[PDB]
Amino acid sequence: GSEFGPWKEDSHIVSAEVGEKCEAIGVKLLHLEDQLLGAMYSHDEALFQSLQGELQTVKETLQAMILQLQPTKEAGEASASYPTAGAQETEALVPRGSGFGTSPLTPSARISALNIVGDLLRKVGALESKLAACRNFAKDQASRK
Numbered sequence: 074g075s076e077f078g079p080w081k082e083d084s085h086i087v088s089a090e091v092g093e094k095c096e097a098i099g100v101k102l103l104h105l106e107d108q109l110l111g112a113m114y115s116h117d118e119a120l121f122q123s124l125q126g127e128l129q130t131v132k133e134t135l136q137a138m139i140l141q142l143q144p145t146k147e148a149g150e151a152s153a154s155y156p157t158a159g160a161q162e163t164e165a166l167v168p169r170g171s172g173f174g175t176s177p178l179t180p181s182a183r184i185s186a187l188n189i190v191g192d193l194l195r196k197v198g199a200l201e202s203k204l205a206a207c208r209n210f211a212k213d214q215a216s217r218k
Contacts, residue, residue, distance in 0.1 A: 079164075082177075082178075083141070083177055083178050083182070084178065087141055087142075087178070087182060087186070088182055090137075090138070090141065091138070091182075091185070091186055091189060094134050094138065095189055097134065098131070098134070098189070098193055098196075101127055101130075101131065102196055102200065104123075105120075105123055105124070105127050105200065106200070108120065108123050109123070109124075109200075109203075109204065113207060113211075117208065117211055120204060121204075121208075124200075124201070124204055128197070128201075131193070131197060135190065135193065135194065138186065138189075138190055139190060142177065142183070142186050142187065142190075144175050144177065156170075156171045156172045158171050161176070162179075
């Protein structure tokens with residue numbers, strides 16, 4: 074129930090969403106890669122369908138992650154003159170106030186989150202290029218002439 078609540082917006086939910094999501098990311102590339110090579114010399118079609126569903130699902134997680142990291146929701150517009158807040162970072166040794174920025178959270182999860190996002194999109198690009206390259210290599214082999 075949390076009578077007080079050590080968090081406000083992001084603290085455990087954002088840290089938990091990355092944990093489960095991340096685990097899914099790896100298991101995805103693992104199953105895809107293993108299925109790509111095997112299906113590659115099989116029917117060179119199983120990898121195509123897998124990529125489509127893998128690209129759509131991953132995009133969904135990439136969208137929710139990037140959105141959660143980049144605030145874009147407010148109550149009312151034209152409402153910003155004086156900064157009000159009970160306590161942003163008073164319990165800690167470093168008294169952090171508020172103003173001149175939204176500030177998602179302490180410098181730890183922000184970097185980590187953006188770290189997986191970039192590392193994820195990077196892995197997808199390399200995998201996509203490999204699939205497109207392999208397909209073209211096999212597609213331009215049957216004809217030859």
